[PDB]
Symmetry: C3
Subunit: 45 residues, 3 copies
């Protein structure tokens, strides 16, 4: 059982790294959109 | 103890699925905003 | 081994809370950008 628990923990950790990588990508795209809205607002005002 | 560990792992996995679902929703809304900034920019230029 | 598993689970849970906090922050900034695109569109139309 301890063994199956150990391999399950590795699969949860693997998934956590995939999630972390997805968040990093989202954060950068989100920062690009914030910059984009800023230039558009500055141009129309 | 192995038992409590097993039920704890299920709660961590449950939480991981909730996180995954939240990211999927964020990704789609983020893609809608990127499209939105694109139409606004195209219209003002 | 059960012991190392227990401390590993706590580290996975710690990481899950950091992820949850990051998502909450992303969600609020994403809602600010949606509001921003709305005001810009309303102004140019
Ligand atoms: Cl956005
Ligand atoms: Y292994
Ligand atoms: Y169970
Ligand atoms: Y402990
Ligand atoms: Y997680």
């Amino acid at each position: 059982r301890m063994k199956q628990i150990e391999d399950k923990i590795e699969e949860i950790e693997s998934k956590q790294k995939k999630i972390e990588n997805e968040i990093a990508r989202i954060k950068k795209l989100l920062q690009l959109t914030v910059w984009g809205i800023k230039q558009l607002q500055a141009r129309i005002l």
